[PDB]
Every structure is written in structure tokens, then in C-alpha cells.
């Protein structure tokens, strides 16, 4: 929309969860699990491609 504004990534994902109905507590209590799942998925897409 306008000029880019810095924002830490954890809060951006918190906002993105809050967008789809799930409250933002879920992200802040399950950060490590979500990070591991995302890393595994992005690792497997490489081999699949």
C-alpha cells in the first residue's frame, strides 16, 4: 500500500493466524513445533520437485 514498515516475523504470523479465526495464543505457545513442521515441509518439497 505505502512505504514498507519493519515488523518481526513472529508477530506477522500471529496476525496471520488471527486472520483465519484461531486466536493468537496458539502461535505463541507452539512456536518450535510450527517451525519444525515448516522446515520439514520445505525440505520435502525440494526432494519431491
Partner 1 sequence: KRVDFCGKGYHLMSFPQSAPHGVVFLHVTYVPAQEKNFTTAPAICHDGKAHFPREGVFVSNGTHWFVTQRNFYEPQIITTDNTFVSGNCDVVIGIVNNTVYDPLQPELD
Question: What one-character DSSP code corresponds to residue 1?
Answer: -
Does 24 participate in binding partner 1 (rule CB under 8 A)? Answer: yes
Min CB(21)–partner 1 separation in Å: 14
Q: Is 33 in the site for partner 1 (CB under 8 A)?
A: no
Cβ neighbours for 23, distance < 8 A, ≥ 6 positions apart? 17
**Position 11 contacts partner 1 (CB under 8 A):** yes
Residue ranges that bind partner 1, judged by CB under 8 A: 1-3, 5-6, 8, 10-11, 14-15, 24-25, 28-29, 31
Amino acid at each position: 500500500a505505502g512505504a514498507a514498515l519493519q515488523i518481526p516475523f513472529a508477530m506477522q504470523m500471529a496476525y496471520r493466524f488471527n486472520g483465519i479465526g484461531v486466536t493468537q495464543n496458539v502461535l505463541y505457545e507452539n512456536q518450535k513445533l510450527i517451525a519444525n513442521q515448516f522446515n520439514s515441509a520445505i525440505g520435502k518439497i525440494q526432494d519431491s520437485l
